[PDB]
Amino acid sequence: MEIRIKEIKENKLIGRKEIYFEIYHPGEPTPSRKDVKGKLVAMLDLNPETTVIQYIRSYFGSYISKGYAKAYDSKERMLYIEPEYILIRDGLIEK
Amino acid sequence: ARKGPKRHLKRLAAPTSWYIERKAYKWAVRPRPGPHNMRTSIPLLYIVRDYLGYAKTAREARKILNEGKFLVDGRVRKDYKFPVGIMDVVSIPETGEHYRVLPNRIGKLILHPISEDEAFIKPLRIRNKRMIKGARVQLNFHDGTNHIVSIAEKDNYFTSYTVLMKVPEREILEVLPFEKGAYVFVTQGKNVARKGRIVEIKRFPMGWPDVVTIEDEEGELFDTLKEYAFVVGTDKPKISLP
Amino acid sequence: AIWQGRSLKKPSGGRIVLARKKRKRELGREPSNTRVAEQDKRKIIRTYGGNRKVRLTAAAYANVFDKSGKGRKVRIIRVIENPANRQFARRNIITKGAIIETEIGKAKVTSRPGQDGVVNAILLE
Amino acid sequence: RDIGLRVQPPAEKCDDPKCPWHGNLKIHGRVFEGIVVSDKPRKTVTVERQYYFYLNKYERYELRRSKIHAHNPPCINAKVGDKVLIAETRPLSKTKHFVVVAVLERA
Amino acid sequence: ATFKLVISDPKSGIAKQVEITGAETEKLIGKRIGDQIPAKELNINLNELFGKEFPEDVKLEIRGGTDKDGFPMRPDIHGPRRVRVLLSKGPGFRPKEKGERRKKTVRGNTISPEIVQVNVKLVY
RNA sequence: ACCGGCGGACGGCUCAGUAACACGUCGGUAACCUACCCUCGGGAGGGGGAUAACCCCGGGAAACUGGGGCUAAUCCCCCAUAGGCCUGGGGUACUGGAAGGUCCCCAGGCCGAAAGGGAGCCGUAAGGCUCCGCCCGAGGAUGGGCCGGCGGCCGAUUAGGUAGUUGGUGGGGUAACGGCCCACCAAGCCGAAGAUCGGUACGGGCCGUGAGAGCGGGAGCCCGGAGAUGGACACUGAGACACGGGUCC
Ligand SMILES: [Zn+2]
């Protein structure tokens, strides 16, 4: 699986950066959220504890899976802004 | 069956001047009463979320707004139902972005970037003039705002004139009169978003509105309503309207 | 109550069947038969939209003006004539068209005591 | 004087408070031309206007009449068959919502 | 006609109940609301009951009462009769809304054998 | 939990009634109301009063509810001023196509405000700043009321209908004009170009069909109108005579 970043936006009204990317993975299943987040943090040199993956969407009959994620400057702002369900899904919140 | 004011607004019945998907959802933000009409206005939530994309959900849009990070004219607005209309300056001091709200050629409202120096000027068309207690003259503008002057300056202002007003301090910069050759910009009608210079003014009996002829930069002549004609300069536009 | 809505008959002469119930906004109120008395009697009525009306039921004084803006507060003795009704004059009922007698002379009323709360009149020279 | 119409004001004055020329009545809205059909009621006149209505299916016109009752100020004493101009005003009665403002030509 | 008398002392904010069966029931019967009755008229102790030293001139003031079927006695309805009336405030009605008017059941000033409780205030 | 503020008159459901200014469209309100929100010019001075919760005693089968003590407020009341409304005599400064409108000066009267309250940071104190607040005036905006011209179904085995009915003179009432209502004057008003009466039906954007002209439908989605078992009434509120508030048959 190869990750290619299609768009980076710097939102500072909310202290975050929005990342739109794609995963090229022919002949393989949809990558797990853990693996996607790990590779994204490794490539972008981000903080693992202040980044979330909004979604990883696999299309029909395609080897490209689209992906949307965010990276926050501060964990406090991350918790304040992001919903609880997405944090639970990403595993940041033990719940 | 109807007993009082409405509090909801379906997306399929939203004003045609908005840039909104009319079938993605069922409910739209009902604009709160404010400066401009509902036809030439849009709730600030849609500007924060859809137009600029700073937010993905109404909740975080409200969270952004409550911190006073969005400025309209020169005042910080926190109500997400606040209407913003034509010839309004939306400023985001944290980003340095300044936009002017103007209608495009199809009558829809769009944000045109402007400069920091321009961000402190808001033209106002004198919609009406009357008298108040103490023998003072009150001018009512196109956006519902009001100003007061002494009887000494009675003749300095007339209906359909334009006033350049610094904001949010509300100081009078200058007065642009409405005569022949005055640069104007059409804000409504079939000729919306078209600019030119005044040529002639025609009046009719009864309450039928007066009609003004305008000449565009290409020399073509068209017509519109005298109230639709918005003065923006004497010979050239004092503000950017592309 | 006193409904003040649409008539039940077409101008041609036919009848009209109501398609809806009476609405609270189309209701009136009983006439305020302002009478001459020894003291002024008035009441306050809350009207549509929270507005206020001052209703005069018994009137004792009157503000009389004489062709020059000068005004005097005088006493009402009797109603000489009230063209609005053939019995208002007999019963001492004050309305906008009444002609009253005061110590200064005859005065024609110019206000609406049922809607104003006061009685104003102009002297007859 | 003028009340927004490009017509000559009546040559005489009247004390009627419902006359737009010499009273407090205000004219606003539609202006129509018509022929007076009846003037029996006091200070009242019925105005008849004649117009054609087009039928799409039969691609032909039919004749229709519009009847309107208008106030008749004493100065403008319109009679039967006169050509008159009427202007919309506030409701003056149950069926009177127009006022005669001029007489275009006597019968 | 057994009356439960609730005597309340305004000088201390304490109320106590007693039960009277007959004989002295007639003396209370027939009196309206707003008239005092001397304590000794039908007194039962009243001294060690409250543990005080009420003066000999102590009087009982008829404040209110309640019928057998939980029906309060309005201090305004005339006569010993039960009637259904439309109330907006006052005894026997608890609005619970802004301008609600609910029709309730109340009695009149005069006590009757049907009355089960008489509430009285001590007057010095 | 209680007082208190706001909301609960929107949203949701149905097509009974309605042939009507109910609906569609174009215009008027110079004849009118508007809680929430926006702008401008001002003000927040002095007093008083209970009562909920709570405590004592209860009843009623329940639904509900009585007496006594005690208290607070952005709760309620009063005084002052500012301010509103009418009328009369004057000046013509304003918007308007045109002033029974607005503005300025005198005169007689009626009505008649507020919470300098709350939170945070400071400051020895005093005092300061920020946030959300209260009241009056003039406009806006939102949501309405009312009115006018035009347009859209069948029956002649339904031919005369109307009598507050048509119009006026003067008033009452309404937030507002109006026979909406009242008193007095006349006989007017509608009708074979189909009044009245009877049948059917929520009106429109639209949907079905046909080469088209046209014919038929107009439940689901949107706008508008009505209803809350059938009727008739009222209280609070800006907004109701109110589907999950009230009274009677
Ligand atoms: Zn005249």
Cα–Cα distance, C49 to C47 (Å, whole number)? 6
Method for this entry: cryo-EM
Q: Which nucleotide is nearest to B81 (CA to C1')?
A: F37
Is D8 (CB) below 7 Å from strand F?
Answer: no
Do the Cβ atoms of A11 and B54 come within 8 Å? Answer: yes
Which tokens is A89 given?
């899904």
Kindly give the distance from the C-alpha atom of residue E96 to the centroid of ligand 1, in angstroms, as a whole number: 62
Residue B153, φ and ψ in degrees, nearest 5: -90, 30
Do the Cβ atoms of A81 and B60 come within 8 Å? Answer: yes
Compute CA B90 distance to the chain's CA centroid, rounded to the nearest angstrom: 11
Which tokens is B230 given?
């918005």
**Which residues, 6 or more positions from C95, have their beta carbon under 8 angstroms from its beta carbon?**
C34, C82, C84, C85, C88, C109, C112, C113, C114
Is B170 (CB) below 7 Å from strand F?
Answer: yes
Protein residue minimizing CA–C1' distance to F68: E8
B–A touching, 3+ CB–CB pairs within 8 Å:
yes
Whether D86 and D70 have beta carbons less than 8 Å apart is answered as yes
Which tokens is E123 given?
């007057």
Do the Cβ atoms of B206 and D6 come within 8 Å? Answer: no
Instruction: Report CA dihedral (B59, B60, B66, B71) to the nearest 10 degrees.
Output: -120
Residue C51, φ and ψ in degrees, nearest 5: -70, 170
Within 7 Å of a protein beta carbon, the nucleotides of strand F are 3, 8-14, 17-22, 27-31, 33-41, 55-70, 83-89, 93-104, 106-112, 132, 137-152, 160-162, 164-184, 186-191, 193, 195-197, 213-215, 221-228, 232-243, 245-248
Instruction: Report CA dihedral (E69, E74, E75, E78) to the nearest 10 degrees.
Output: -90
Going by the DSSP 8-state scheme, the letter that residue C9 receives in this structure is B
Cα–Cα distance, B94 to E9 (Å, whole number)? 70
Cα–Cα distance, B223 to B241 (Å, whole number)? 19
SS3 of residue A59 by DSSP = coil
Among C86, C3, C84, C75, residue whose Cα is nearest residue C40: C75
**Up-side HSE of residue B84: CA atoms within 13 Å toward CB?**
30
Is C8 (CB) below 7 Å from strand F?
Answer: yes
Do the Cβ atoms of B63 and A11 come within 8 Å? Answer: no
Side chain identity, residue E13: G
Tell me the β-bridge partners of B195: B185
Going by the DSSP 8-state scheme, the letter that residue B209 receives in this structure is P
Tell me the β-bridge partners of D36: D47
Cα–Cα distance, B190 to B209 (Å, whole number)? 16
SS3 of residue C6 by DSSP = coil
Cα–Cα distance, E44 to E38 (Å, whole number)? 12
User: Buried b / exposed e across E40-63, counting CB within 10 Å, b at 16+?
Assistant: eebeeebeeebeeebeeebbbbbe
Do the Cβ atoms of D28 and B205 come within 8 Å? Answer: no
Cα–Cα distance, A56 to A90 (Å, whole number)? 12
Cα–Cα distance, E105 to E93 (Å, whole number)? 9
Peptide bond connecting B168 to the previous residue in cis, omega within 30 degrees of 0 = yes
C42 burial class (0-12, 13-18, 19+ CB within 10 angstroms)? middle
Kindly give the distance from the C-alpha atom of residue C122 to the centroid of ligand 1, in angstroms, as a whole number: 26
Whether D87 and D99 have beta carbons less than 8 Å apart is answered as yes
Long-range pairs for A38-47 at CB < 8 Å and ≥24 separation? A39/A1, A39/A3, A40/A3, A40/A69, A43/A3, A43/A5, A44/A5, A44/A19, A44/A71, A46/A71, A47/A71
- Residue B29 CA, nucleotide F74 C1', distance (Å): 30
Q: Which nucleotide is nearest to D62 (CA to C1')?
A: F193
Kindly give the distance from the C-alpha atom of residue D41 to the centroid of ligand 1, in angstroms, as a whole number: 18
**Up-side HSE of residue B229: CA atoms within 13 Å toward CB?**
33
Is B40 (CB) below 7 Å from strand F?
Answer: no
Residue A36, φ and ψ in degrees, nearest 5: -60, -45
Q: Which helix (H) or strand (E) holds C40?
A: none
3-state secondary structure chain E: CCEEEEEEECCCCEEEEEEECCCCHHHHCCCCCCCEEEHHHCCCCCCCCCCCCCCCCCEEEEEEEECCCCCEECCCCCCCCCEEEEECCCCCCCCCCCCCCEEEEEECCCCCCCCCEEEEEEEC
The backbone region for B148, taken as left when phi is positive above 0, alpha when psi lies in -120 to 50, beta otherwise, is: beta
The Cα-based distances of B44 to B40, B99, B153, E11, E84 in angstroms read 13, 13, 36, 64, 57
Cα–Cα distance, B201 to B12 (Å, whole number)? 39
Compute CA C124 distance to the chain's CA centroid, rounded to the nearest angstrom: 21
- Euclidean distance between the first and the last CA atom of chain B, given in angstroms as a whole number: 48
Q: Which of residues 62-81 of C touch strand F (CB under 7 A)?
A: 63, 65, 67-73
E–A touching, 3+ CB–CB pairs within 8 Å:
no
Residue B237, φ and ψ in degrees, nearest 5: -65, 130
Side chain identity, residue D92: L
Kindly give the distance from the C-alpha atom of residue D73 to the centroid of ligand 1, in angstroms, as a whole number: 5
Dmax of chain C from CA atoms? Answer: 56
Kindly give the distance from the C-alpha atom of residue D13 to the centroid of ligand 1, in angstroms, as a whole number: 5
Among B42, B54, B36, B47, residue whose Cα is nearest residue B9: B42
Among D104, D97, D96, D88, residue whose Cα is nearest residue D3: D88
What is the stated resolution of the deposited model, in angstroms?
2.7
Is E109 (CB) below 7 Å from strand F?
Answer: no
Side chain identity, residue C82: N
Which tokens is C103 given?
């110590």
Cα–Cα distance, A26 to B67 (Å, whole number)? 46
Look up tokens 């709730």; give the residue. Answer: B43
Q: After which residues is chain C broken (C to N over 2.5 A)?
A: none
3-state secondary structure B136-201: EEEEEECCCCEEEEEHHHHHHCCCCCEEEEECCCCEEEEEECCCCCCEEEECCCCCCCCEEEEEEE
Cα–Cα distance, B126 to B186 (Å, whole number)? 15
Q: Which of residues 10-39 of C touch D (CB under 8 A)?
A: 11
